[PDB]
Symmetry: D2
Subunit: 208 residues, 4 copies
């Protein structure tokens, strides 16, 4: 079984993106008898599409789990829906901000995630990791690769399971926000990584 786990580079503002570390730390491990690959996507619409599609073609994973930073979220959120729209608030890392374009013209308005989101959520709860299901992943790069991946699954037949997991800030990112008079929630890195490993394990146990 191959599993692709992606993460992103530092989105605008942040100096660190914990999903870049989760991708690198899971690269090359084996969970059960499944090889796990970990790749870090650019936060550039276009280039991220190019890279995501080469990686999908090249590895042909059975399960792809895309992970991103959700600033200000307080628990792990498992994404339910990806939607066919880009309405970027911030610019991407090249400086382009896209207001209301579709991702794939004429492709469906939305795709539901194919990961077993409620079993992933229940198992995370059993391990004491607070987690919930979110119904919107945003309309910037996190939703763009979540849509592109489930579109690829519908079109080409693989990956067989695709989905997105958003993670809080890790504590070390909070301490310079304190300075600007704000203290957003955080989760420690080790719980974040453990969470996307539990996700890979219950996706594998479902996927035959």
């Amino acid at each position: 079984m191959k599993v692709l786990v992606t993460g992103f580079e530092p989105f605008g503002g942040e100096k660190i993106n914990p999903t870049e570390r989760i991708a690198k730390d899971l690269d090359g491990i084996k969970i059960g008898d499944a090889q796990v690959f970990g790749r870090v996507l650019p936060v550039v619409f276009g280039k991220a599409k190019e890279v995501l599609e080469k990686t999908l073609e090249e590895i042909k994973p059975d399960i792809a789990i895309h992970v991103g930073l959700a600033p200000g979220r307080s628990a792990i959120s498992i994404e339910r829906i990806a939607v066919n729209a880009i309405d970027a608030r911030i610019p991407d890392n090249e400086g382009k901000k896209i207001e209301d374009e579709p991702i794939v013209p004429g492709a469906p308005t939305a795709y539901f995630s194919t990961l077993p989101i409620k079993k992933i959520m229940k198992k995370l709860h059993e391990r004491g990791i607070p987690a919930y299901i979110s119904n919107s992943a945003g309309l910037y790069l996190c939703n763009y690769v979540m849509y592109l991946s489930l579109h690829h699954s519908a079109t080409k037949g693989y990956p067989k399971m695709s989905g997105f997991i958003h993670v809080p800030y890790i504590p070390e990112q909070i301490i310079d926000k304190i300075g600007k008079g704000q203290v957003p929630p955080s989760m420690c890195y080790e719980m974040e990584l453990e969470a996307v490993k539990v996700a890979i394990e219950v996706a594998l146990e479902e996927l035959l």
Copy 2:
């Protein structure tokens, strides 16, 4: 040097109070050449006073650091001010809810904490633990023992440093709140404990 660290039992609602574990885990350790004592206070106004004063008389600590659960707070907060008032929203664990009584009649309206709160905060930041200074500790038991302790310091001469540290929920407490449609912030236990150890260490380095 003796250091008293207190924590509380489960306040109404909660099944677990992480400050009870912080008190037990620090009891009997030695940081440098300072003995640390750890005691767990009842969440009953009156009985908590009785126990706090016996413990203070019996150990005569140089530094007392009182620690409590601040549900919904997202980082470590170091308390600046204790005030002479009780205006309990919840009842204490015996069932008495006190609306607008002073703690010590005719004693000052407020005491500033004597811990070096800004150095504690800066060092926590250096260790990547998000922390800030809070200006109100509530007016239920957390503020009651914070006031009683700094009053004892002013009256009897010891402890020489007194202060209060409030800690977030720990992740395992968040997962049944998710059920009632809510996900409050959390901090992992090990960061909480490390944080009150760093507090003890920079209070000791100041206190001669």
Copy 3:
């Protein structure tokens, strides 16, 4: 031109639902040369479908604008997407709580709103009403009638514009939450009503 505006009864918990008053106050008025009808839907899955479809068949509105209470939201939110799923957290007013059922089996996963959401939003801003575009309407009755309505638009050809507007609590609903130690955001009723009238007016100015 006929405009249907709906609102709901008190959802579970609340004693008042301001969208019930907005529906009654707009019933029978004329904006320009457009007749406005206002109806109040039950908060019961099934019955709400039945009533919505009779009302749509009977009035055959050119524009339908469905309005609901979004507890805890701080500004007017104009909904972008309705999705084909029900995952009720609370039970509906008859006591049935539905976990993961589609609304219309085999109908699309999502429908984008057909109201001119960015022009409605810009005009609200010009009148000083804080408003933003939300990308998830929930998966309980607010999203159920938003989906059913845009499905009817796609299937039967009318209404020609359909959409959903969520409104904050009104101040009089906040004052007993204060009691349970919480103060959620609110918006005054008159601004809420003015806001769905401005929505009707820029939908009418677009719709030929």
Copy 4:
């Protein structure tokens, strides 16, 4: 009876401060047989002290009610405690940021407000204005003039009642925050003004 009501100019950032309008609108009115004066204080430590003391000496009010903007608060908050400390996060309007200075050296650590805060709060609730008692007013200018005023009351004998009321943003201030991806709570101006008039009326009904 004379009543002084103050408000402030635009603090750093904001282009508008609603408490400046509340001060101007109440200036010169009479509530019962009480003349009301309304003055707008500079947001400059030092100059605000100078102006506050001249105004207090010149009008010799029986009741002073100081009002300020509390960004992000969702209801009216009636301040319980003023504390003798300045620890400015933002600079004041001249550019000085003060970290840990007392307001009046050797004067008490805190003063409780002398307004009948719980009767003001109960009456606001009766008029459906959401309101609560806050236990910290900050440690920048809002707390500085609240401390200076209750100090003057204790020292010189007048004003006989002194207190501070913080108000939410008004809706027109929220709409450019929406742009920076945020929508803080708001309250409409007319409810804010009505709220400090109700405060003046129950303070007058108490004050003999």
